[PDB]
């Protein structure tokens, strides 16, 4: 019974006809799938690991210099040599300094000076390549079945159970068939390669701390760097980045090695994502995974059960989840055995016609023990109602109010869909996907518009997006012709919303 009270939750309703639905398993969110006569299963992407890592480059942020030496040549001579310019472990700089009889030779003006310092690195940061293969997705699926509120704790404890199944999708094995004993099996046709676009993402490491950085960012940061293949005593390429040569007014030249640069690159790591390592593998989060859910072998477990005929008792007060949905936990005083829990809700208790909906879709007591408890979940209608559990006269009830009006629920659905379109781009059209030509046409149009948008506004931050968006609204509202005005207004609104949605 995971996915309950996660505040980033989705409800996909498998349409009648067709046994498959498309979902986008976002890392951090979750989704519960409920078909017309199938048990409700909530599915969450828990871990994303990268198994094989190839060192691509190793920058330096804690350089040091030890052996300082200088050579000078008088004016109208050649150039100073110092014999250390033949050593690649040293960084050197040639400059012109004032020379004269006081300095100790014949002519006056613009001698040649060279300073060399032995470069060493004390702390280096390593980037690693990530291939779209050899990364493994883990997926936790829990069935709205027997278990009570009491097994949601330690949700990261991916323990397989009678109601909990763990699948492990890889680009080599993207089609696992998840078997949940009793409820049948769930089919997953996942797309591991089209996730976070790990091709353009290295795995930065610096001081036992890891990030997931873009390729261009890692290749465009100026520091002394050596190739990943460089093993042993590294040969540092751009030593001049961490070493500054300054000349006394016109007399000498001094070398200094700059600071630790760790905070500088932390500030440079702005839009990056933190990541962990399990010892050799890049365990991470914040990705997403597109899967196709095959509900063929899913079906309700205890349909042939008889209704529970004994006194149910509430053990916890029904609690509203963050999406207008009420959680109910009850205790059974009967010892008859595995039985159907009779639960519904009605606006009026005289003609107790069922109203609203039920998420669990088959509440069942599965224990023959005297006092056993189970957990439910309902989708009440907007307004007042009653959560009635039990058959006879010894039933129990709980007055319930739901404040989510239909228009308000539609607005929340719209903002949730817009947020997922902002986060996922065109992949958001694959979340409610069950097929359809309107869906495909809209996804294609969004694909081409998003490609144009990425080309025109790709590298831009929150503040820059806001600035250009405001300028575009102005270039909209105040414009001669309406077509260009419409385009400018649309682009400005899209940029402002893209900043706001992550901001809000």
């Amino acid at each position, epitope marked *: 019974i995971r996915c309950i009270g996660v505040s980033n939750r989705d409800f996909v309703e498998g349409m009648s006809g067709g046994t498959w639905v498309d979902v986008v398993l976002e890392h951090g969110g979750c989704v519960t799938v409920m078909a017309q006569d199938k048990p409700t299963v909530d599915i969450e992407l828990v871990t994303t690991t990268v198994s094989n890592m190839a060192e691509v480059r190793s920058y330096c942020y804690e350089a040091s210099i030890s052996d300082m030496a200088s050579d000078s040549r008088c004016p109208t001579q050649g150039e100073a040599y110092l014999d250390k310019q033949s050593d690649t472990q040293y960084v050197c700089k040639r400059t012109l300094v004032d020379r004269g009889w006081g300095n100790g030779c014949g002519l006056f003006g613009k001698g040649s000076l060279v300073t060399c310092a032995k470069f060493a690195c004390s702390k280096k940061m390593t980037g690693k390549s990530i291939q779209p293969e050899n990364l493994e997705y883990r997926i936790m699926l829990s069935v709205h079945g027997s278990q009570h509120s009491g*097994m949601i704790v330690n949700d990261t*404890g991916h323990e*397989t159970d*009678e109601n909990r199944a*763990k699948v492990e999708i890889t680009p080599n094995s993207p089609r696992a068939e998840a*078997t949940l*004993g009793g409820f049948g099996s769930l089919g997953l046709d996942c797309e591991p390669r089209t996730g976070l676009d790990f091709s353009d993402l290295y795995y930065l490491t610096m001081n036992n701390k890891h990030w997931l950085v873009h390729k261009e960012w890692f290749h465009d940061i100026p520091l002394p760097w050596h190739a990943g293949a460089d093993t042993g005593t590294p040969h540092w390429n751009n030593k001049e980045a961490l070493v500054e040569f300054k000349d006394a007014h016109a007399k000498r030249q001094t070398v200094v090695v700059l600071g630790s640069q760790e905070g500088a690159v932390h500030t440079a790591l702005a839009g990056a994502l933190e990541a962990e390592m399990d010892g050799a593998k890049g365990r991470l989060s914040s990705g997403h995974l597109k899967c196709r859910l095959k509900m063929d072998k899913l079906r309700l477990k205890g349909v042939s059960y008889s209704l529970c005929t004994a006194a149910f008792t509430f053990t916890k007060i029904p609690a509203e989840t963050l999406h207008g949905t009420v959680t109910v936990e009850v205790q059974y005083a009967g010892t008859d055995g595995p039985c159907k829990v009779p639960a519904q809700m009605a606006v009026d208790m005289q003609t107790l016609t069922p109203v609203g909906r039920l998420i669990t879709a088959n509440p069942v007591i599965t224990e023959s023990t005297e006092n056993s408890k189970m957990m439910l979940e309902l989708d009440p209608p907007f307004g007042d109602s009653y959560i009635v559990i039990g058959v006879g006269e010894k039933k129990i009830t709980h007055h319930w109010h739901r404040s989510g009006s239909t228009i308000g629920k539609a607005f929340e659905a719209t903002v949730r869909g817009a947020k997922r379109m902002a986060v996922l781009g065109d992949t958001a059209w694959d979340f409610g996907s069950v097929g359809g030509a309107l869906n495909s046409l809209g996804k294609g149009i969004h694909q081409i518009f998003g490609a144009a948008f990425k080309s025109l506004f790709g590298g831009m931050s929150w503040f820059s997006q806001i600035l250009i968006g405001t300028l575009l609204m102005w270039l909209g509202l105040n414009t001669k012709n309406g077509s260009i005005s419409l385009m400018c207004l649309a682009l400005g609104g899209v940029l402002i919303f893209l900043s706001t949605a992550v901001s809000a």
Partner: antibody
Amino acid sequence: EVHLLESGGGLVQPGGSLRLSCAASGFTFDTYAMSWVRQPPGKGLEWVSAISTGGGSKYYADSVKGRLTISRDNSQNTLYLQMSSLRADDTAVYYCARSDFWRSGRYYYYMDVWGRGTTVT
Amino acid sequence: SALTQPASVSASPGQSITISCTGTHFDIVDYDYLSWYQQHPGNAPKLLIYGVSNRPSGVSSRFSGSKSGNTASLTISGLQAEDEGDYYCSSYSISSTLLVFGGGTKLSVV
């Protein structure tokens, strides 16, 4: 190779208790859901209890439920069974069997490797 | 919802003996989670067939399982003398007692 060794079996007066123990080797004991099966002398097998890969879920048959508790300890790679309120009906040999009950992908509620068994009276 | 098995069967070597297992709707008709076990006296049981038809590595092809309705049967072709021993069927039950076993058939080779 894959060996399961039991211990603790023996003679116990009716109405008492007893502490079984099954040892595991070879396979990764933490990734396998282990089950408990008994057979009274001259009679058929009956599955008694099963535990999850981590001990977070326990299952029992509706003849020993409330009378036995199955526990595992992953660090020492061993699994136990807790007798309680014993009686003559519990006189059997207890087989420690490795199960594929809930692992990943597809399973079929079968048992691969079984222990030698221990005698209980 | 216990499984019922024939008490005993007898067959001569070189023939085929069909052992059968039948149960209620709680364990058989809906589930392929059906496993067959054989047990020599004073020995641990051994799995021959899992998932109705599939067979573990290291098990002879003579054992072939099948299911049809309330009853599922296991067939042993080319019977030998060492095939003597008890045979059990286990299934997954939607009730208490998650796994239920058959009554146990004493196979005899004549």
